[PDB]
Nucleic acid binder design. Structure first.
Lengths: 1186, 27, 173, 92, 83
RNA sequence: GUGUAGUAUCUGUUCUUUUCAGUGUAACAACUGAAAUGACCUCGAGGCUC
RNA sequence: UUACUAAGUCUCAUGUACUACAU
């Protein structure tokens, strides 16, 4: 019997974008022989990690480091009296101090010491989640949210040394907001806010700790009880000029305090407030404080929940005495930012927990302390200042922004073939389509006469050292010639009466045009004139099949018998022909040779029978043979510059594309790399780009596939344009890099520019003063009938309000005849929304208000007046909030809190057609989905999925299966009839399947007999009904099929029958914290056997390195060396529940980056194929499976 | 130990299934 | 639902019964006892079907049909007022008692005549607590056949409690 | 220990130091006393090291150990690796 | 001897990992551990923290985090009541 | 093929102060304390009994 | 047509294994 056992291949296509941690240190010295500068930053999101530099005033990707496979719960850089390397704490409790190093040709992250603490999980006892380092780098401190605090004393030597941990344990005191005070080397002092866990009243009390380097323990110093309203602590550096006595800034909600260590000085300064105070107004708070000091002037920046950015300076109050004062003022503010840094340069990096991280340079620096108007003082602690925010943005100037989606709420999958993902932007509220396809610009296109075929571009020999370049087009009957100059595109002898098989430049200032019947040898004469010095027939008068060429070299193949070899004479311009017969023994199909060099060995010949031969250019010999499928449609030979590999790119008829490694000396055919793209005979062309210079081959089909090879990797890709008939690299004085001249399949010339390429790190491009939209997006919708038309729905933060913005095709739509591209709905807020078509010709929209009211709308497309017109129809009161609804046949299928109502279409309001009462277990329905209108899968907050079946004439959904365990399901879909996808609030990605015992029953029986009537259940099921009525109430159970843990929270699953024409249908998910990843079902077995073995290798690979490094120490690198963190793979990915059949490819991908020594060291554990074939199978997934 | 069958005056969106069947027998 | 089956040869086994009755209807469960005093089969089984429709069907078609080991297979489908009366006359027949108590209430069973101490007493079963109250009210401490009889509730301590009227009312309902 | 019951452990937050075991006890995972596929070197709190007592076998507490003790792969997954400082304080 | 050791390890594991139900544990004592660990993970994962931030609709995310921290202590209910 | 100490496990056997109250138990069990003597009625039960 | 459950504690004997210890 065939084992179902779905084998899913997880990939992270785009890596988690919500940046939770940062560090200011200078890690690597790159591109400079000797340089030391403190300006650089490394930022971490849980697993994912990135390293940015500025140094230009504009932020720069340095390298995206390998996936750590853990949850980084804090990261802080340490600077010791040297290269500054960051201390990193995560799950496993391990304190892992890592240095970013340059190894081989890339930057890899090396670990120095990892210290075991607590256990492996995210815990309250776990001394993580609160971490800071002595600003002089003498000691690192970790703490726990509740139980205990540990502080290591860090020392540097020939090898780094971490001192034994210093423990303090307070059982009932829940710790929050660790903030360490800088010191002069006196003694390290850290400050916390301890809230008592077990108490009758809520008591939040600050506590000071001075670690004593002399006595080597942490000492409780001052315990100050403050109001329960307390928020956070910041460290005031010295106050050495005013009057060891550290001073802290305690942010409360509606006011700020600062407190002395000795309690002598407690200063209350009330935080100012906005003028509008829109709708709901909290007492607010300050989320993030930071400190800066220069030229005796130290000011701190503290930002409120509204994003208001404030400063404090200290004044002596010379009149009274020398004593500290506290002075608030107002700045440019910003959006809410989790953490703030400042370079030694005037650049202030704002890391926003909301969406985007952006960097500043401050000039105005803010208002002077002299003004009493807008500045508040500690003179009178009771006072209030109202201020209107300033969008003019005087103080701070945005230099660089980083496009990221931290809160991606929903998305729809648009343009299934190029995997394009349509999702909102949270703050800016712009439409973001992030795409797998290559980003392709289009500029100054021009309409060509109909029925065009191929294209070429050759430098104009007539004008030497000039921008003029000749562009050649082809029609079957006619040939068109065109002249290129900057901004000047003009039209022009040669042969216009016959199709052009080939044309190329020879040597210097010469051209040859090969056409079906005869050749032409053309040379430039004067400016607009050219002259043929010689003309050729084929054998003596046939139809030339094909032609290829090199720089100085040429080949043409006539009908059948012989092939013709040409060269150009050196020191002059001439053509010669050899006397010889290369009979080729068959009819030559197409010819290929390297045109990159003046002399190209190893011609590549194709045969109509479907075989490919090599020709040694002693002289000619056939060293290899390929029998491949259908006849070759087109083929190109290209040797890359970097590695010098000569690759033969062989396109085939019916749309199969192929690629071959070609040995230079032997000419053997090895390393077959195939693909299937579209249905059409493919076309190929060669282009050269950068992103170091680079070369790719464009492939023309139903789609357009750029095949490019990055370093030791290559990825075929679809391009953003729908289709391209013929493509060749182009250059213009108008700035052109990656620039290309091509033609659409419509027979229209166009110029374009490719920009971003889907590398392993990116795999996407994101198509989108300070800009913040008041409307925060809600959901995203798409019409069933229109294949892709995407409707967006947002909300207002304030008085309840909504907007609806519909887009189809390129950009949005107008609303009616109005200028506005969106619609505003007053007093309507959307808890959940879905669009429905009750009739095939009518389209309605569905809103569920927080007022518990169901609102119906009508969508209109104006069509060449084209605009969206929304129309309010009915009003219906609802009992529940309606968290989930969807399209059932002809009807709205909605879920109340308890029960599932199926509404029909009534007039003046919509009607309840049927109601289904849930089993007692289900409290609420988060999300639900249908299978072909027959079946449903209904999710819960607390409990798990339960599948229903619609019974006609019973007018009810009957639950036929329960779920095994309790799982909190955010989003849920169907792969099939019998299986279900689901995610968790906590980050589990699982897939369940109904048991075959149930599938036989439902396949062999009608649903009407389930609720009442005769259905014969095996003896065990009934005994489970009377024995365990609570679990088996639904009389079946989901056997766990696939389970996985992705640390994000999955927002949207989508099951795509094909990803960029790939055969294996994938399921792609976007997470909330932002991510998109896929689960690819693996066909056959040895796919998942080889993948499983590679994952098993990379799993303990760090341990294998540790045991080798151990044995060599027995005959004469820590344990977490290769993983950089203590977490095992199976442990991290297992976590909540063990992964079942899912093998994680995100691990096996890390095998690609390791050096050849390490890789060959790992693969020796297998009797199976060599490292090269390993990398083959690894890279096979992105190419072939999507 | 609430279904709505939509009468023709468009006020029957509150009207029960069995009630509208009774008005089928009456109609 | 459940049917009794009997006149079974101990050589008839469980799989043989199952294969036998699946021919008639679907069989939910089979309880086919196994003696812990003979270490075999005691020759009668119980077959629980999926409903009393298939149960009664198998009772009709199966009864006196299948012949197993020459022996025929058999199939068979699987709280009132009580008054103690003392000092009755020796001339009082049970049928005379029936006639006497019929006027007051319908009798669910026949009276029970027994002798205490010499002392003729009887138990009379009424279908109704209220009709029993009638025979009590009229017949208590009365002279029949020139003998004084006493009519009260029989012990269970004696019938006629508060919960007794409540539940006997329901058993009447 | 896994076998001898009266043996008491330390269970404090392990330091940077690595516990030593004698050649006689060599190969045992200090928790389960297993000989198979060891993983991570034991780490003991500073309170168990200091002077001469640091040289003792963390397992048998008597002999002076040369070798480092490693946790097995079963204890490293059971998490007993990170439980605390393994040592045997009482001789048993 | 063995059980007697299990008592000491009960004291140590209870000290480190806080709440561990031994034999008799009041529902108030244990449910408090439940609430504390659930909130602990809600605020502990930046993921679920980002999630609760939006679904709750607070102006900033750290409001949700420190909210959960405050929500760990019992008196925080009456504290909200006194606002 | 023996002796010293000691252990476990069958099986046989048999039902320990009638009650009350406390501990104890999941309820039992078990443990801890005390003690009615006399009269009468119906069929070991029963008593707004004295 | 019989709708599926019995030994326990004590006492004094029998049945059978066993553990330290000595020739």
């Amino acid at each position: 019997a065939k084992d179902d056992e779905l084998y899913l291949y997880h990939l992270t296509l785009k890596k988690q974008t919500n940046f939770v941690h940062s560090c200011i240190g200078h890690f690597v010295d790159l591109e400079a022989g000797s340089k030391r500068e403190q300006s650089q930053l490394c930022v971490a999101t849980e697993t994912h990690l990135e390293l940015y530099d500025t140094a230009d005033g504009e932020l720069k990707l340095i390298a995206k480091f390998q996936n750590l496979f853990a949850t980084i719960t804090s990261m802080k850089s340490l600077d010791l009296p040297w290269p500054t390397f960051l201390a990193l704490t995560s799950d496993s409790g391990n304190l892992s101090i890592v240095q970013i190093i340059m190894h081989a040709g890339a930057l890899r992250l090396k670990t120095l010491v990892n210290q075991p603490l607590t256990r492996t999980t995210l815990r309250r006892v776990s001394p993580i989640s609160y971490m800071e380092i002595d600003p002089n780098g003498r000691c690192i401190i970790l703490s726990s949210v509740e139980q205990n605090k540990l502080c290591f004393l860090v020392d540097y030597a020939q090898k780094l040394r971490i001192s034994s941990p210093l423990e303090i344990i307070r059982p009932h005191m829940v710790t929050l907001d660790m903030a360490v005070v800088d010191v002069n080397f006196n003694n390290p002092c850290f400050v916390t806010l301890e809230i008592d866990n077990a108490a009758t009243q809520l008591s939040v009390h600050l506590i000071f700790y001075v670690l004593e380097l002399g006595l080597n323990h942490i000492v409780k110093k001052a315990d100050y009880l403050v109001n329960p309203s307390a928020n956070f602590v910041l460290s005031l550096p010295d106050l050495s000029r005013y009057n060891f006595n550290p001073f802290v800034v305690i942010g409360f909600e509606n006011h700020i305090l600062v407190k002395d260590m000795n309690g002598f000085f407690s200063l209350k300064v009330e935080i100012p407030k906005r003028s509008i105070t829109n709708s709901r107004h909290k007492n607010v708070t300050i989320i993030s404080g930071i400190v800066q000091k220069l030229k005796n002037d130290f000011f701190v920046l503290l930002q409120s929940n509204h994003g208001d950015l404030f400063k404090l300076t200290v004044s002596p109050d010379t009149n009274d005495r020398n004593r500290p004062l506290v002075q608030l003022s107002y700045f440019d503010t910003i959006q809410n930012s989790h953490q703030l840094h400042i370079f030694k340069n005037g650049y202030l990096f704002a890391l926003s927990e909301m969406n985007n991280n952006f960097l500043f340079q401050f000039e105005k620096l803010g208002v002077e302390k002299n003004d009493f108007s807008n500045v508040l003082t500690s003179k009178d602690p009771n006072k209030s200042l109202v201020f209107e925010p300033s969008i003019k943005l005087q103080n701070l100037s945005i230099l660089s922004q980083q496009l990221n989606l931290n809160p991606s709420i929903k998305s729809q999958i648009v343009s299934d073939s190029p995997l394009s993902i349509a999702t909102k932007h949270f703050t800016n509220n712009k439409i973001i389509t992030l795409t797998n396809a290559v980003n392709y610009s289009n500029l100054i296109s021009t309409s060509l006469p109909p029925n065009a075929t191929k294209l070429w571009l050759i430098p104009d020999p007539a004008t030497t050292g000039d921008n003029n370049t000749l562009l050649f087009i082809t029609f079957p009957k006619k040939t068109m010639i065109l002249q290129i100059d900057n901004e000047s595109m003009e039209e022009l002898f040669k042969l216009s009466q016959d199709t052009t098989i080939h044309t190329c430049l020879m040597g210097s200032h010469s051209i040859i045009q090969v056409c079906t019947a005869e050749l032409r040898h053309i040379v430039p004469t004067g400016k607009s004139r050219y002259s043929n010095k010689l003309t050729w027939v084929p054998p003596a008068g046939i139809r030339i099949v094909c032609a290829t060429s090199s720089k100085t070299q040429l080949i043409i193949s006539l009908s059948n018998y012989e092939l013709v070899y040409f060269k150009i004479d050196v020191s002059s311009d001439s053509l010669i022909e050899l006397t010889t017969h290369p009979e080729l023994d068959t009819m030559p199909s197409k010819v290929a040779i390297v045109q990159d060099t003046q002399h190209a060995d190893l011609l590549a010949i194709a045969d109509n029978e479907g075989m490919i031969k090599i020709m040694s250019l002693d002289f000619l010999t056939v060293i290899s043979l390929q029998l491949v499928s259908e006849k070759i449609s087109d083929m190109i030979m290209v040797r890359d510059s970097s590695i010098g590999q000569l690759n033969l790119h062989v396109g085939l008829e019916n749309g199969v594309y192929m690629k071959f490694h070609i040995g230079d000396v032997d000419g053997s055919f090895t390393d077959i790399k195939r693909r299937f793209l579209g249905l059409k005979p493919v076309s190929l062309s060669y282009l050269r780009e950068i992103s170091k210079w680079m070369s790719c081959v464009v492939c023309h089909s139903s789609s357009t596939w750029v095949s490019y090879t990055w370093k030791n990797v290559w990825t075929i890709r679809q391009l953003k344009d729908q289709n391209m008939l013929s493509c060749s690299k182009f250059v213009n004085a108008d700035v052109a890099i990656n620039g290309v001249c091509s033609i659409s399949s419509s027979g229209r010339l166009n110029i374009g520019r490719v920009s971003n390429f889907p590398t392993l790190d990116n795999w996407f491009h994101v198509h989108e003063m300070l800009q913040i939209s008041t409307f925060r997006p809600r959901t995203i919708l798409s019409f069933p009938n229109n294949p892709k038309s995407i409707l967006f729905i947002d909300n207002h933060s304030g008085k309840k309000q909504c907007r609806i913005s519909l887009q189809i095709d390129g950009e949005c739509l107008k609303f009616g005849s109005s200028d506005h591209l969106y619609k505003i709905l007053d007093d309507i807020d959307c808890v959940s929304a879905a669009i429905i078509d009750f009739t095939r010709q009518a389209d309605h929209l569905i809103i569920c208000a927080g007022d518990k009211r169901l609102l119906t709308y009508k969508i209109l497309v104006n069509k060449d007046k084209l605009s969206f017109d929304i129309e309010l129809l009915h009003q219906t009161e609802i009992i529940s909030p309606i968290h989930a609804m969807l399209k059932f046949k002809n009807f709205l299928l909605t879920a109340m809190g308890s029960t599932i109502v199926l509404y029909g279409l009534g007039k003046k309001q919509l009607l309840r057609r049927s109601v289904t009462q849930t089993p007692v277990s289900i409290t609420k329905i988060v999300s639900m989905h249908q299978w072909n209108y027959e079946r449903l899968a209904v999710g819960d907050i607390h409990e798990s999925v339960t599948l229903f079946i619609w019974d006609p004439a019973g007018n009810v959904f009957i639950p036929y299966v329960d779920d095994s365990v309790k799982r909190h399901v955010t989003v849920l879909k169907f792969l099939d009839e019998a299986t279900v996808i689901g995610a968790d609030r906590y980050g589990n990605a699982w897939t369940l399947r109904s048991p075959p015992e149930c599938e036989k029953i439902m396949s062999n029986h009608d649903p009407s007999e389930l609720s009442n009537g005769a259905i014969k259940y095996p003896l065990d099921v009934i005994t489970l009904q009377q024995k365990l009525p609570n679990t088996y109430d639904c009389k079946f159970k989901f056997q766990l099929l696939n389970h996985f843990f992705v640390n994000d929270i999955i927002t949207d699953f989508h099951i795509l029958d094909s990803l960029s024409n790939s055969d294996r249908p994938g399921c792609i998910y976007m997470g909330l914290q932002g991510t998109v990843g896929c689960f690819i079902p693996l066909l056959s077995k040895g796919n998942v056997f080889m993948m499983g073995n590679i994952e098993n290798i990379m799993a303990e690979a760090d341990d294998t390195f540790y045991l080798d490094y151990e044995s060599r120490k027995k005959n004469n690198i820590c344990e977490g060396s290769c993983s950089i963190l203590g977490r095992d793979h199976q442990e991290y990915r297992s976590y909540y529940a063990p992964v079942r059949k899912v093998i994680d490819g995100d691990l096996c991908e890390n095998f690609l980056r390791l050096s050849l020594n390490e890789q060959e060291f790992l693969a020796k554990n297998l009797k199976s194929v060599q490292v090269e074939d390993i990398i083959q199978t690894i890279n096979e997934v992105r190419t072939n499976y999507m | 130990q609430e279904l709505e069958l939509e009468e023709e005056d468009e006020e029957g969106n509150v009207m029960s299934k069995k009630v509208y069947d009774e008005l089928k027998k009456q109609g | 639902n459940t049917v009794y089956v009997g006149n079974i040869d101990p050589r008839i086994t469980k799989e043989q019964l199952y294969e036998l009755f699946i021919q008639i209807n679907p069989v939910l469960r089979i309880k086919y006892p196994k003696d812990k005093v003979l270490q075999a089969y005691q020759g009668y089984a119980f077959i629980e079907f999926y409903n009393q429709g298939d149960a009664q069907y198998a009772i009709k078609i199966m009864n006196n049909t299948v012949r197993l080991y020459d022996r025929l297979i058999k199939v068979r489908q699987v709280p009132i007022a009580k008054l103690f009366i003392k000092n009755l006359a020796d001339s009082i027949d049970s049928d005379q008692l029936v006639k006497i108590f019929n006027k007051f209430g319908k009798l669910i069973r026949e009276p029970e005549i027994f002798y205490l101490s010499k002392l003729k007493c009887a138990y009379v079963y009424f279908e109704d607590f209220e009709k029993a109250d009638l025979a009590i009210k009229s017949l208590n401490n009365q002279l029949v056949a020139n003998n004084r009889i006493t009519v009260d509730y029989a012990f269970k301590n004696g019938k006629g409690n508060a919960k007794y009227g409540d539940d006997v009312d329901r058993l009447l309902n | 220990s896994r076998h001898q019951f009266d043996l008491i452990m330390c269970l404090k937050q392990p330091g940077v130091q690595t516990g030593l075991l004698c050649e006689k006890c060599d190969g045992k995972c200090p928790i389960c006393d297993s000989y198979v596929r060891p993983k991570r070197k034991v780490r003991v709190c500073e309170n168990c090291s200091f002077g001469k007592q640091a040289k003792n076998c963390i397992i048998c507490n008597l002999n002076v150990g040369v070798n480092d003790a490693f946790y097995c792969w079963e204890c490293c997954r059971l998490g007993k690796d990170k439980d605390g400082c393994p040592r045997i304080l009482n001789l048993g | 001897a063995e059980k007697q050791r299990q008592l000491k390890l009960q004291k140590i594991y209870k000290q480190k990992y806080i709440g561990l139900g031994d034999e008799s544990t009041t529902r108030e004592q244990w449910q408090r551990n439940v609430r504390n660990d659930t909130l602990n993970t809600l605020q502990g994962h930046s993921a679920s923290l980002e999630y609760v931030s939006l679904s709750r609709g607070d102006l900033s995310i750290r409001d949700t985090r420190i909210h959960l921290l405050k929500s760990m202590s019992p008196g925080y209910k009456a504290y909200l009541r006194e606002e």
